[PDB]
Amino acid sequence: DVSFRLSGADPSSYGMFIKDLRNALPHTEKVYNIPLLLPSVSGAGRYLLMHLFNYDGNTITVAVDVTNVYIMGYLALTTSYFFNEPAADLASQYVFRSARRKITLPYSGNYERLQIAAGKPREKIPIGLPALDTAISTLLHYDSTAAAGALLVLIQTTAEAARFKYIEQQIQERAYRDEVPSSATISLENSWSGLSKQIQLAQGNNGVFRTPTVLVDSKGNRVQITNVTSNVVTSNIQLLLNTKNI
Ligand SMILES: OC[C@H]1O[C@H](O[C@H]2O[C@H](CO)[C@@H](O)[C@H](O)[C@H]2O)[C@H](O)[C@@H](O)[C@@H]1O
Ligand SMILES: *[C@@H]1O[C@H](CO)[C@@H](O)[C@H](O)[C@H]1NC(C)=O
C-alpha cells in the first residue's frame, strides 16, 4: 500500500508519495529506461491501495489498477464506491469487500464522462495540494456531482503525477495555492497512451516513433514528438502503458 497525508504536506512529502506510488507498480522490463507496466495481473494483486488523509486526518482508500494506473473505486468509512464500468466492477470482486454497502457511481472513470458529470472540463478545475484535500473531504460523503469534480482532481494529482514528472512538479508548485492545470499538463494526460505506444514501437525502429505525437509545451506552443531523444521521453514520462492494453 502507499499513503499520503495532507496534514503537514509540502512539495517534498508529496514528491515522496509520488515516488512510493511509482515504486509500488510492478514491472519486469524497462523500455528506454522507463518502467513498462505489466500486460496483466490476476486476482487481488492487480490493485494497489492508496491511503489518503485529509488535513483533519479523515481518510479514504483508493484502489488503483497496477497495469494502467486507472483508479477503479475507493472506500470511505464503511461504504465503497466504484466507477460504472466493467473493469471497476471486476475490481469490486477483490477490494473493499468488507464495506457495509457498495455504491456504483453513475458514470465511468474516463475524463469525458467525469467532466460531463461535473459540469465543467478539467481546464477549468483548479488542482493542487489544497484541491486534493478538498477532494478527499468531498469523497467522504456521497454526492455524485461533487464527487465527479473531486475525482478529476484526485486522478490528476495521483495517478497522472506518477506518469509524468512535469505533472508531479506542476502539483508541487501548487502545494499551497491551486491553479487550473497548464495546457501542457492536459496534453500529456491526453497523450499518455499514444506516447507509451510510440516509445514501445521505437524499440525496433531505431528510437524513431512510427507515428509522431503532438503535444503542447510549457509556453503553450504545439510541438511534435518524433523519437526517443525528445525531453518528453528522456526526462518526463515515468511509466509506460503496455501496448497489449492499447
Ligand atoms: O479511472 C481512473 C483514471 O482516469 C484517468 O484517465 C481517465 O480518463 C481517460 C479519459 O480520457 C479514460 O480513457 C480513462 O478510462 C480514465 O480512467 C487516468 O487514466 C488514471 O490516472 C486514473 O486513475
Ligand atoms: C528527433 O528529435 C528531435 C526533437 O527533439 C529532432 O530535432 C530531431 O531532428 C529528431 N531526429 C530524428 C532522427 O528524427
Q: How far is CA 124 from CA 115, 119, 127, 179, in A?
A: 10, 10, 9, 9
For 124, the grid coordinates are: 477549468
Q: Which residue, chain included where needed, has cell 465527479?
A: 148
The structural domains of the chain, ordered by start, are 1-162 (3.40.420.10), 163-246 (4.10.470.10)
Burial of 75 (0-12, 13-18, 19+ CB in 10 A): buried
User: Smallest Cα–Cα separation from 60: which of 1, 18, 122?
Assistant: 1
For 243, the grid coordinates are: 501496448
Cα separation of the two ends of the chain: 26
Tell me the CA–centroid distance for residue 70 and ligand 1, in Å: 5
Q: Which residue, chain included where needed, has cell 515522496?
A: 16
Torsion of CA 22, 85, 199, 18, to 10 degrees: -20
Torsion of CA 136, 44, 72, 34, to 10 degrees: 90
What region does 69 belong to: left with phi over 0, alpha with psi -120 to 50, or beta? Answer: left
Question: Ligand 1 within 6 A of 118 CB?
Answer: no
Pick the atom of ligand 1 nearest to 159's CA.
21
Asked if residue 16 lies in contact with residue 2, where contact means CB atoms within 8 angstroms, the answer is no
Asked if residue 36 lies in contact with residue 197, where contact means CB atoms within 8 angstroms, the answer is no
User: Smallest Cα–Cα separation from 68: which of 230, 243, 241?
Assistant: 241
User: Smallest Cα–Cα separation from 233: which of 132, 163, 136?
Assistant: 163
Phi then psi dihedrals of residue 28, to 5 deg: -110, -20
Asked if residue 92 lies in contact with residue 73, where contact means CB atoms within 8 angstroms, the answer is yes
Closest ligand to 209 CA? 2
CA distance 73 to 230: 35
CA distance 51 to 233: 30
Q: DSSP labels for the chain?
A: -EEEESTT--HHHHHHHHHHHHHHS-EEEEETTEEEE-S---GGGGEEEEEEE-TTS-EEEEEEETTTTEEEEEEETTEEEE-SSHHHHHHTTTSSTTSSEEEEPSS-SSHHHHHHHHTS-GGGS-BSHHHHHHHHHHHTS--HHHHHHHHHHHHIIIIIHHHBHHHHHHHHHTSSS-BPPPHHHHHHHHHHHHHHHHHHHGGGTTTEEEEEEEEE-TTS-EEEEEETTSHIIIIIB--B--GGG-
Sign (positive or negative) of CA dihedral 102, 55, 71, 96 = negative
User: Between β-strands 47-53 and 2-5, what pairing exists: parallel, antiparallel or unpaired?
Assistant: parallel
Tell me the CA–centroid distance for residue 67 and ligand 1, in Å: 12
Tell me the CA–centroid distance for residue 214 and ligand 2, in Å: 14
Taking CB atoms and a 6 Å cutoff, what residues make up the pocket around ligand 2?
A: 208, 226-227, 229-230
Concerning whether 160 is annotated as a catalytic residue, the answer is: yes
User: Between β-strands 101-104 and 79-82, what pairing exists: parallel, antiparallel or unpaired?
Assistant: parallel
Asked if residue 139 lies in contact with residue 150, where contact means CB atoms within 8 angstroms, the answer is yes
Residue type, 135: A
